[PDB]
Design a protein around this ligand. Structure first.
Ligand SMILES: CC(C)(C)[Si](C)(C)OCCC[n+]1cccc(C(N)=O)c1
Ligand SMILES: CC(C)(C)[Si](C)(C)OCCC[n+]1cccc(C(N)=O)c1
Ligand SMILES: CC(C)(C)[Si](C)(C)OCCC[n+]1cccc(C(N)=O)c1
Ligand SMILES: CC(C)(C)[Si](C)(C)OCCC[n+]1cccc(C(N)=O)c1
Ligand code: NA
Ligand code: NA
Ligand SMILES: [Zn+2]
Ligand SMILES: [Zn+2]
Ligand SMILES: [Zn+2]
Ligand SMILES: [Zn+2]
Ligand SMILES: [Zn+2]
Ligand SMILES: [Zn+2]
Ligand SMILES: [Zn+2]
Ligand SMILES: [Zn+2]
Lengths: 348, 349, 349, 348
C-alpha cells in the first residue's frame, strides 16, 4: 500500500487523529517494520498538553515511543536482521559516535540535541501506525516469541524503572531498603524488578488502598499511605535508619519531600515521575550526607535487552488493554480519564 | 381529511420554532396538495432562524421544511401527470419556469424568481413540516416510487446540493483525477458516495473530527486527513505533490477555503458549497493556480434531483436518519443546534 | 473474519461501559457464532449496572446486550438446523433444557438455571453488543427471515415480555372483556398492539403524560385516562363499575399497583410487569376482589418469541427505534439514563 | 467391543435376526448408551408386515423403539448427563426448532418428515442392541434407580396412553366415565393412568375374560366383553348418558363403531390402536354433537417425565416377560402369536 494509517498529533491543543500518510520506504541503513504493538502512556499526554506558546516545530507527529514490530524490509547494507524478525524499538536514539553512545548509554548522548536526533513518537515518526522506519539496526532489540503486546510496555514502563534502579543497584544488597512511591505504572514494574535483581526490602507508598494491595502481590514487603504521615510510617518500618534508595515515580513536590525525609545517609533518591517545577533540594542539612539525587532518563540499550530477558523469564508481568489502530484516539481519551487498567497498547 | 393541521413554524425573530394549529391548505388550479410523509430538517434552517432582527423585513409566520416528501392527496384543477397516492419528492429551489435558465432545466439559477418573489418551500413559502403542503406546479414534484420517504427527504438537499456541485465539473473527474471533500457532515458524506458512483476519481476527505474521517473511509474515501494548517501538506503528501483536480468545500470556512486554494491543481476547480458569512476564495494571479475556477453553487436542478433519486433507489446513497414527530419538531431543532444529530433529522407525520 | 472484535463491556462497578478490543470467539461443539446485526438496549441494562458494589459477586467483565439479532457466521461441531447466513433472533432467558418446565417450552421458568449458573446473554453471559457473539444452543435462535434486524431486536424483550404477560390470561380476554394498560412507554404500547392483534378485548390506557394518552389511542387503545389518584375512578367510570378483566401494569410502582387492585374485576387478573424495587400487590381477603389472580411474569417462552416475530412480519407490531454504532454504545446508554430515547435504542455494528 | 450384537430387520418378509455390527461411536452432540432393556410392541410387527412399496425405513434396521440404558460415552460438547446415568429414550424425535417442537410437542413436529428425522427402531437404529446412539441430550429422560425392565415399556406402552388421556384430561372429572377398549399391552397401562391422574369411572372392554380379570385388579370399575353387545352393556352401566371418553387401543372398525355408539355428547374418542383402513366416521347424526375424534401419536417429552414420575411413585405396574438378546427373534414370534403376558422386554 502506498499509504498507511497513523495516529498523529497534528495541531496544538487538539486530540490525536487517525490519518492516512504515505507508507515510508527504508533508506540505506534503515529498517522498515510492520508494527505489531504500540504502547501509549502519560508521557504522550504531557507532550500533547504542552502549550502553543512554547511550540516551535514538530507537527504533524506520528505518536508512539513504545514500539514493537516485525522486520518488513531492510535498507541497503543492513545486516544482522532478517524479514520477519520480531524486534522492540529502542526509544532514546543517540548519535552512536560520542563517548556516551560508545559506552552503550545512548539515552545520555551528548550530541543528539545538537544533531536533532529525537526519539520515535517524540520528534521522529512513532510506532502508532501500520509501518514505521527505524534509523539504525542498533535500535532494534530482538524479543523472540514474546507476545508483542507484552513487549511494548517494556520499552518504556520496564526500561525506565530498570535504569533508575540499575544506577544504584550495588547499594541494594541484603539488609537494604528500597522505597517506591507510586505503585501504579512504572512503580509496579519497579517493584517486580527490585525483587528479581536484588534482595532489598521493598516498601510501597501510594495514595490508593487498592494499588498498595496489588503492590504487595508483586513483592512489596510493606505498604504505606502517601501523604504527610508517610515519612513517619516509613521510618517506623525501617527503624530510625531510613531507606537506602527512594524511587519516586510520582515526582510531585510532596513525594520528593517525603523521599528527602526518609532517605538514609549515603543513600539515593531517584526522581522518575515528572511534575513541572517539582525538584529535590540538595543542600547541607536539607538532605542526609552523601545521599545523591538524580533525574534519570529512559535507559540504555543493554538495559532494554535485560528487561526483555526478565520478561521472557516470567519475572515481569504488566497488565495490558488492547486497542485497534482506529481506536488510537479513543485509547488516549481513556488514558486521560484514568479508565485504562494497566497499560494501553495499540495493535495495528 | 380535516380542516386544520399541525405545523412547525418560525413565528417571531430570535425565537425557537413552535407547533401550531393552522388550516389545511386547499389546492387551486395547477397546484397539488400532498400528505407529507417525511420532512427533513437541516442546518440551513438554523442559519435562517439565526437571522438578526435588524435584517428582518417580512416573511413570518413560516411553515418550516425545505426537504419535503409525500403522497399526492388532491389534484388541483387541470393537473395531469400524477394520480392520488403517488409518492413524490418536492423540488426545492422553485423558479419562474419561463426564463432562459428555467427553460434549460436550471431552475435553481432562475433570473426572475427574486423579482417575482418566488421562494422555496420552508424558506419563504409554506414548508413540508406539516400534515399537508401545497406544491405550486406539477414540475416541482419528482416521483420516488417505493423509496422510503425518510430516506428520500434528506436527499432533496444533502443529496441534490453536492450532486449539483459535482456535476458542474464532472467531465474533469476522470480516472487518474483526485477530488478533495472538505467537511464529511451530511453534505460531504453523501458527496463522497456520489463521487464513487458517477466517477472513478480518487477521493481524499478532510475533516476536523476523527470519527468523521473514519466515516469518510467507510463510504469510499481512499484517504482522509485532518483539517487545519497542515491539511494542504498532508493532501499533497498523499498525491505525490500533484494537487487535486477538484476541491468540494462543504464547510466553507475561510480556513477550509484557504486549504482548497493551496491544494487545487492547475486548471482545476474549487466549489464553495458550505456557507460561513464573509468567507471567500481569493481568485487572483499568483494567489490561486492558473485556470483553477471557483464557484459558489446553489442547490441543484430538477433533472439532477431525478438522478439523485435513481442513485438512492439503486442503493448507492445512504445517510443516517433520526425520525421525529411533529410535536417533537422544535425539540429536533434544539438537538440540531447542539449538534447531537448524526446524519439528518427527519419529521414523520 | 478477524481474530479480534469490538464490544461494549461493563468492566467496573459504578463505571460506565466502554468499547473494548477482545478476541473473536470461536464456536465450540453445539454452539453457534453469530455476526451481530442489531443489539438493543433497554432500562434493564441500567438496573443491572446500577447495582451497588456491596452485592457484587463475579459478573465482570460483561459484554452487554440481551436483545440480540444477527446472521449465522459459523456452526459449531454437530450443529444442524441453520445454515451460514440465516437471520435469527436470540432467545434471551436461557434455561437448562432438561427440566419439566424446559421440556414444556417454558425455559424462562427453568427450575435449574439458577443452580447451574445459566444466565441470559448480556446478563451473565456475553451479550450481543459486539461484532460477534456465541449462542449456547441452536434452540435459542429464532428465525426472522427478511425482517429488519433493527425492528426485530427490541421485540426480543419489549415484545416478548408483554406478549408473555398477556398470553398467561389470554382466554379471559374475550369479546366484552376489558384490559387496562398502565404505562404506555416501550413495553406498554407494544402491549396495546398485541392486545388488539390477538384478542377482542377493550383496551384502556393509563399514563402520566398527556402526549402518551394520545399515542395510546393511536396504536389501538379505545380509551385513555390520566395516571394518578383519580385513575381508579376514571377507569371504573368507563367500565360502569364492572371492573377490568385484566390489568397489565408496565410501571410497577406501588401507586399503579394500588390502582390495579382498585379496578380489577372479580375473577380477573393483575400482571405486575414493570419493576420498582419494593412495590408489591397485596393479595388478601377484602383487599382485592375474589378470584383476581396476581403474578410477576418473567420475559417469555420460545414459542411466544416465534409468535412475536410472526406478528412483526405481518406488520402488527411497531416500536420506534434509534440506531447507534458500537463506538456510540457508551453514549447510547447515557442517553437512556437521561430518558432521552423515544422507543428503543439499537446498536448496529 | 469393536462390534456388538443387534436384532435387525434385514429384508422384506423375513424374520429379524441377531447379527453383529460395528459398535457406534457418539459424534458431537450425540450420546452412546449401554442398553439395559429394550421393549417389543405390536407396532414392530406392523412395520415388519409392510410390503416392499410401503416400507420406507431403510434396510438393515435395528429394531426397538422402547429403549432404556445407561450413559456409556458422551459426544463432544454434551453436558447434562454423566457416564452411568440411567436414562430412558424419548422416541418421536423432532427437529427441535419448529413451533410444535418449541412447545414441547416434538411428537407433532412439522419438519421431521421433510428432514428425515425418524425414531429409533423406526428409521433410525433402535434399542435392541448392546449399545445405541441417541441424537441429542434432550431425547434422554432420567429414571433414577427405576428397574430398567419396568422402565422400558414406559417409553411407549406408558407414554402413548398417557398422551391420549392427557389430550382430554380436563373432561375426566368426578362423575365422568372413561371406556378402555383392549386392556392388554397399552390399555392395561391406560387404566392405571386414568386411576392415577383422574377420578373418572373406568369401564374395561376386551374379548378375553383373562384380560378383563386383570383390568379389574388395576382399577377398572367394570368389565364388558367386546362384541355387538358391548355398546348396550356400556350404556346399561351408565344409564343412557354415554361415556365422556373412549380410548380405543384396539383400533379395529368394530371397536371404533362401539366407541361411536357409547361416546357422550361433547365427549371424545381416541383411536390409539392401528388397524389399516379402520376409521371413525365423524359426521352429523353419525356421532354425538361435540364428540371429537383423533388418532394421537406417541407423546411429548414432558409427558414422558410424568410417566416416569408415576412409575417411581408406584402408580404404574407393567407386566413384563424378560428375554435375552439372542432370544430377540424368538420373542417376536411369541408376540406375533399373542402369547406374551403384557410386555416383552429384551435385556442385553
Ligand atoms: C518525563 C520526560 C520529560 C523524560 Si518525557 C515526557 C520526554 O518521557 C518520554 C520517555 C518515557 N518516560 C516516561 C516516564 C518517565 C521517563 C524518565 N524519567 O526518563 C521516561
Ligand atoms: C444557508 C444556505 C446559504 C446554505 Si441556503 C439559505 C442557500 O440553503 C437552502 C438550500 C439547501 N442548501 C444547503 C446547504 C448548501 C446549499 C447551497 N450551497 O446551495 C443549499
Ligand atoms: C433480570 C433483570 C433484573 C435484568 Si429484569 C427483571 C429488569 O429483566 C430482564 C429481561 C427483560 N425484561 C425487561 C422488562 C421487564 C421484564 C420482565 N417483567 O420479565 C424483562
Ligand atoms: C405411529 C406409527 C403409525 C408409526 Si405405529 C402405530 C406402527 O408405532 C409407532 C409408535 C408406537 N405406538 C404404538 C401404539 C400406538 C401408537 C399411537 N397411537 O401413536 C404408537
Ligand atoms: Na482545512
Ligand atoms: Na395509576
Ligand atoms: Zn511511554
Ligand atoms: Zn551520541
Ligand atoms: Zn436542508
Ligand atoms: Zn426562471
Ligand atoms: Zn431489554
Ligand atoms: Zn430447565
Ligand atoms: Zn412400542
Ligand atoms: Zn420440529
Amino acid at each position: 500500500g502506498s499509504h498507511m494509517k497513523a495516529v498523529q498529533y497534528t495541531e496544538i491543543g487538539s486530540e490525536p487523529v487517525v490519518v492516512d500518510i504515505p507508507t515510508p520506504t527504508p533508506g540505506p541503513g534503515e529498517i522498515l517494520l510492520k508494527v505489531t504493538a504500540a504502547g501509549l502512556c502519560h508521557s504522550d499526554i504531557f507532550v500533547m498538553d504542552m502549550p502553543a506558546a512554547q511550540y516551535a516545530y514538530g507537527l504533524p507527529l506520528t505518536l508512539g515511543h513504545e514500539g514493537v514490530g516485525t522486520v518488513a524490509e531492510l535498507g541497503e547494507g543492513v545486516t544482522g536482521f532478517g524479514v520477519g524478525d520480531a524486534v522492540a524499538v529502542y526509544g532514546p536514539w543517540g548519535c552512536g559516535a560520542c563517548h556516551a553512545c560508545a559506552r552503550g548509554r545512548e539515552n545520555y548522548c551528548t550530541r543528539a540535541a545538537d544533531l536533532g536526533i529525537t526519539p520515535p513518537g517524540l520528534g521522529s515518526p512513532g510506532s502508532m501506525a501500520e509501518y514505521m522506519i527505524v534509523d539504525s539496526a542498533r535500535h532494534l532489540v530482538p524479543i523472540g516469541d514474546l507476545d508483542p503486546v507484552a513487549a511494548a510496555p517494556l520499552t518504556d514502563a520496564g526500561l525506565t524503572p530498570y535504569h533508575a534502579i540499575s544506577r544504584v543497584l550495588p547499594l541494594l544488597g541484603p539488609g537494604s531498603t528500597a522505597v517506591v512511591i507510586g505503585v501504579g505504572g512504572l512503580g509496579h514494574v519497579g517493584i517486580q524488578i527490585l525483587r528479581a535483581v536484588s534482595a532489598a526490602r521493598v516498601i510501597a507508598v501510594d495514595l490508593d488502598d487498592d494499588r498498595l494491595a496489588l503492590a504487595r502481590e508483586v513483592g512489596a514487603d510493606a505498604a504505606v499511605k502517601s501523604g504527610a504521615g508517610a515519612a513517619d510510617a516509613i521510618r517506623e518500618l525501617t527503624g530510625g535508619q531510613g531507606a537506602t534508595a527512594v524511587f519516586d515515580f510520582v515526582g510531585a513536590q510532596s513525594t520528593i519531600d517525603t523521599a528527602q525525609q526518609v532517605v538514609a545517609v549515603d543513600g539515593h533518591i531517584s526522581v522518575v515521575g515528572i511534575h513541572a517545577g517539582a525538584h529535590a533540594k540538595v543542600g547541607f542539612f536539607m538532605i542526609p550526607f552523601g545521599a545523591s539525587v538524580v533525574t534519570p532518563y529512559w535507559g540504555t540499550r543493554s538495559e532494554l535487552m535485560e528487561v526483555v530477558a526478565l520478561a521472557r523469564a516470567g519475572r515481569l508481568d504488566i497488565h495490558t488493554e488492547t486497542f485497534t489502530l482506529d481506536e488510537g484516539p479513543a485509547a488516549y481519551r481513556r488514558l486521560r480519564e484514568g479508565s485504562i487498567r494497566g497499560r494501553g497498547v495499540v495493535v495495528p
